[PDB]
């Protein structure tokens, strides 16, 4: 007769709900569960935020969950983050890449198995070191996301330096004033941080200003080589792709493995209190919440499906792996991988805007 410790989840589909139920089962199989045994509790995303918040209370907090796994909906993890945060119940983001969830003030008990987009600056930095791009021009959107990338790239740079940083208003379709300012500089390495629709805007104007050809280097993230951004992207661009970043199944495995370990680690300590049973009539935080957060934050699982799972000072994923993509003859060709710490070039040659620098 062990103690049943529930783990909650807000997932995309019933297949994903079954994958979660299996991941938890396997965890119980692989751990010593005489004392504590896990139980999966889950729901799929609700049509709207009010219904989603209500679902967390009715379906998960009602079951006294110790943590809630959240996949990015096919709507945001925020109603989940706020409801769970209210009680200090940790939330594990599986596919949310937006840098705002790294905000400890608003998202006060949140960890993610995927890094925020701002973390691609770690790859660009290694790339700059490798190709000896000591002078760069950084173009960012004047939104939380764009500033997150700047703030992060700037941190790594403070060797290689950013000659100028240019911010633009999200939704601006004519950026030839921004891009002409960039063309005047000696630096020909342009780094871009912008949403798919804003990346398109930059791409079109840069082409009109003949800045997408030989001489220039375009270094970019995942969003900027996705959807409409890819239709107007200059041939020779360098983009990124977070390996398994959209694989909710791989992230369910890994999050459960991590949570299962942390639960068992937690119960090695004394005076572990249960979370509140439901929302109604409960306005007190879970006293064990903050300790369980510390335990999770400091958890390492190296044999994860998506790699070495570790969390940074913001509970964001460390040692994420990316595909270094190069647009060659309007085809997205992988030219290497950022393995979590090092750049590994593959036998496919990089074609730079034009030919070879």
């Amino acid at each position: 007769d062990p103690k049943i410790v529930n783990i909650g989840a807000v997932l995309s589909t019933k297949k994903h709900e079954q994958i979660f139920r299996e991941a938890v089962n396997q965890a119980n199989k692989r751990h010593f569960t005489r004392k504590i045994q896990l139980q999966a509790t889950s729901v799929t995303h609700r049509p709207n935020a009010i219904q989603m918040a209500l679902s967390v209370c009715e379906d998960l907090i009602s079951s006294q969950v110790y943590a809630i796994l959240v996949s990015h909906p096919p709507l945001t993890p925020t109603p989940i983050s706020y409801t769970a945060g209210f009680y200090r119940i940790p939330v594990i983001g599986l596919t949310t890449r937006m840098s705002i969830y790294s905000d400890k003030s608003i998202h006060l008990s949140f960890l993610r198995t995927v890094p925020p987009y701002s973390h691609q600056a770690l790859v660009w930095f290694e790339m700059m070191r490798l190709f000896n791009w000591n002078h760069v021009i950084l173009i960012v959107s004047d939104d939380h996301e764009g500033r997150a990338a700047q703030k992060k790239l700037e941190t790594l740079l403070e060797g290689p330096k950013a000659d100028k940083v240019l911010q633009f208003e999200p939704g601006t379709k004519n950026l030839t004033a921004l891009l002409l300012e960039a063309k005047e500089l000696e630096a020909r390495v342009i780094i871009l941080s912008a949403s798919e629709d804003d990346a398109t805007a930059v791409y079109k104007s840069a082409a009109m200003l003949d800045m997408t050809g030989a001489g220039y280097v375009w270094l970019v993230g995942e969003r900027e080589i996705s959807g409409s951004a890819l239709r107007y992207a200059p041939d020779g661009i360098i983009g990124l792709q977070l390996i398994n970043g959209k694989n909710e199944s791989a992230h369910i495995s890994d999050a459960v493995a991590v949570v299962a370990q942390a639960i068992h680690e937690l119960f090695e300590m004394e005076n572990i209190t249960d979370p509140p049973r439901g929302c109604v009539g409960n306005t007190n935080i879970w006293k064990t919440g903050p300790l369980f957060k510390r335990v999770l934050m400091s958890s390492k699982y190296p044999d994860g499906v998506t790699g070495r799972i570790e969390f940074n000072e913001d509970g964001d994923r460390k040692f994420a792996q990316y595909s270094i993509m190069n647009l060659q003859n309007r085809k997205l060709v992988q030219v290497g991988i950022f393995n979590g710490s090092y750049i590994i070039q593959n036998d496919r040659k990089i074609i730079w805007p034009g030919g070879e620098t």
């Binding site: 049509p47 709207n48 935020a49 009010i50 219904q51 918040a53 209500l54 209370c57 009715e58 109603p79 706020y82 409801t83 209210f86 200090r88 400890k104 003030s105 608003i106 006060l108 008990s109 439901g278 929302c279 109604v280 009539g281 409960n282 306005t283 935080i285 903050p290 300790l291 957060k293 510390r294 934050m297």
Partner: protein, 352 residues
């Protein structure tokens, strides 16, 4: 004139009888709410919408539960219904309100309070100080306000230290204690929640920082319900409070009803329409292309009985008459000053 449905939600003990004392007319309904958790508040407001068809909500509570501001902002933006946090946890300082928010609070802002704190310091020539914040939303806006104010003052202010305490983790390692030992200033400005402040103070006492020669200035939310005084609060603690004394609950409810009614009358007598009170919280996704926060331009600058009830760009009251309070020996909050209009009027020249 046509009628508008206004719901007055009152969490806790209230004199409903005392409380019961244009182009459109209000049809008010006093609602008593028992619980303040997310489910209860979301459910209560949603059921009221479902029956009466509510043009706006006037909310008041007796709690030290500042999350009610967040819950109410969330409800407000999702349903696109005006909500006025007229007292308690609902009127306390918050994170950045939603782009689509229609939440307005009777309390003072982060930056307003921060200035009031420096005004107290200038008065008693308390120029040497430190700041200690947690991650509570706006902590950077608080530090930045002080810093900007300080760096343009031809006064000899000296901000010795700025501590950032992570309260989201367990303090078994004694990290907070080691950080608090860094403090050397006679004046400490503490920005955090009432719950966080009780822990911080228990620690600060261990390190001998709550005693004589150490003064702690704190914002409205740390004092909160002046009738709930944590034992760990230091005697001689200075705080800002929104005048629960002279701006009593019935006046606030009346002013809340006035704001919604005026705003609605204005939009009607200008656009020949008002926003339709949506009868569901479970259809928000479907009908958002039909809804907007248009009423905010009318809600933000209402004047009634000559009293200027206008709100800031961030949804806090524009001109609040704040009250400076001191936690005395009999562990009770005492009035020691007033902040009316850019000017501070204190009780004492020298503190006893």
């Amino acid at each position: 004139p046509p009628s508008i449905g206004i719901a007055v939600i009152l969490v806790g003990t209230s004199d409903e009888v005392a409380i019961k004392d244009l182009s459109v007319v209000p049809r008010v309904e006093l609602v008593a709410m028992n619980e303040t958790d997310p489910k209860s508040i979301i459910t209560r407001i949603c059921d009221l919408m479902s029956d009466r068809k509510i043009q706006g909500v006037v909310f008041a509570d007796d709690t030290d539960q500042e999350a009610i501001a967040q819950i109410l902002d969330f409800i407000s933006a999702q349903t696109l219904t005006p909500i006025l946090g007229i007292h308690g946890g609902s009127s306390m300082i918050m994170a950045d309100k939603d782009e689509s928010s229609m939440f307005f609070q009777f309390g003072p802002s982060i930056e307003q309070q921060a200035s009031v704190m420096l005004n107290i310091m200038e008065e008693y020539d308390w120029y040497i100080f430190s700041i200690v914040t947690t991650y509570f939303p706006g902590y950077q806006d608080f530090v930045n306000k002080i810093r900007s104010t300080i760096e343009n003052s031809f006064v000899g202010w000296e901000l010795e230290e700025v501590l950032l305490l992570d309260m989201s983790l367990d303090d078994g390692d004694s990290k907070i204690q080691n950080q608090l030992k860094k403090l050397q200033s006679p004046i400490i400005l503490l920005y955090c929640t009432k719950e966080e402040a009780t822990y911080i103070f228990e620690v600060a006492n261990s390190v001998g920082l709550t005693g004589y020669g150490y003064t702690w200035i704190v914002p409205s939310l740390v004092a909160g319900d002046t009738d709930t005084v944590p034992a760990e609060f230091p005697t001689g603690l200075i705080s800002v409070s929104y005048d629960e004394w002279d701006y009593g609950l019935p006046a606030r409810v009346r002013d809340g009803i006035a704001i919604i009614t005026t705003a609605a009358s204005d939009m009607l007598s200008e656009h020949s329409f008002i926003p339709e009170p949506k009868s569901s919280c479970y259809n928000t996704h479907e009908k958002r292309i039909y809804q907007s926060n248009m009423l905010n331009r009318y809600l933000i600058n209402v004047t009634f009985e000559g009293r200027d009830l206008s709100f800031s760009e961030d949804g806090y009251q524009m001109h609040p008459k704040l009250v400076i309070i001191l936690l005395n020996k009999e562990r009770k909050w005492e009035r020691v000053g007033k902040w009316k209009d850019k000017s501070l009027q204190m009780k004492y020249y020298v503190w006893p």
